[PDB]
Structure 1
Amino acid sequence: AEASKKPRQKRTATKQYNVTQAFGRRGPEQTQGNFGDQDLIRQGTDYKHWPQIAQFAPSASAFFGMSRIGMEVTPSGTWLTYHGAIKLDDKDPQFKDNVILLNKHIDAYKTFP
């Protein structure tokens, strides 16, 4: 399933190519991703609740329009840095549940062991 050929930030995680394979292990360091319980870990964009998650990932235009964009450069490297926040819709019916979905993958690896 060729797909690592893509730049990290463009990869799509699936059954055939999981989160861990695409984006490395979940973990405490500032350079690692912290999101995803085991099911999402294994299934990526196949998980049965992906679309509910993905409704919050930004478009390309919003990624660069909403975020605080930075450049970090060290002797061996150059990184685009970014941070921001997405407000959830307090009126949406799904609100509670969206919070429960989100809160369960957020720091999940921490209750793997």
Structure 2
Amino acid sequence: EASKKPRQKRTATKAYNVTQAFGRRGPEQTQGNFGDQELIRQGTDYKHWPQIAQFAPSASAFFGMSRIGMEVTPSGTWLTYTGAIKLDDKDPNFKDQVILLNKHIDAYKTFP
């Protein structure tokens, strides 16, 4: 039931984890690089998910803020995206936010 969904609409959870929904973390251009082993294993059941999720864009923001392209290639047709989301450094939590995000960025380098 979880795996029936198009990839961009999947919701990772302990039962259907980040690796299962979105592939092994890793270094390549269109492979995901985000998550330490606890997030990878728990998905949205991760205890600090909401403090990560506060940075994800709404659908309107996703198409409003991003640089969208379309590439047709031997594998299919791909909607490419790029953008950046500013952290609020007025937020007393800003320090914590950074540390939490950096915990998960490229964390895969540190384990098998």
| TM-score when normalising by structure 1 | 0.96
Distance in 1 (CA, whole Å) between partners of 2:33 and 2:43 is: 14
Which residue of 2 is the match for residue 4 of structure 1? Answer: 3
Q: Percent identity among equivalent residues?
A: 96
Which residue of 2 is the match for residue 26 of structure 1? Answer: 25
Which residue of 1 is the match for residue 42 of structure 2? Answer: 43
- 1:4-60 CA distances to partner (integer Å, 9 max, x unpaired)? 100000000001110000000000111210000000000000001000000000000
Say how many residue pairs are matched: 112
Distance in 2 (CA, whole Å) between partners of 1:48 and 1:28 is: 26
Distance in 2 (CA, whole Å) between partners of 1:47 and 1:76 is: 33
Distance in 1 (CA, whole Å) between partners of 2:54 and 2:110 is: 26
Q: 1:32 to 1:76 in 2, by over 3 A?
A: closer
Distance in 2 (CA, whole Å) between partners of 1:91 and 1:31 is: 32
Distance in 2 (CA, whole Å) between partners of 1:76 and 1:95 is: 40
Q: Report the CA distance between 1:76 and its aligned residue.
A: 3.7
- Report the aligned-residue RMSD: 0.8
Distance in 2 (CA, whole Å) between partners of 1:76 and 1:16 is: 29
Q: Report the CA distance between 1:75 and its aligned residue.
A: 3.4
The 5-angstrom pairing of residues 1-113 of structure 1 reads 2-113=1-112
Distance in 1 (CA, whole Å) between partners of 2:111 and 2:75 is: 34
Distance in 2 (CA, whole Å) between partners of 1:86 and 1:29 is: 22
Distance in 2 (CA, whole Å) between partners of 1:28 and 1:55 is: 25
Q: Report the CA distance between 1:112 and its aligned residue.
A: 1.0
Structure 1 consecutive aligned stretches of length 4 or more whose deviation exceeds 4 Å? none
Q: Structure 1: 5+ residue runs without aligned partners?
A: none
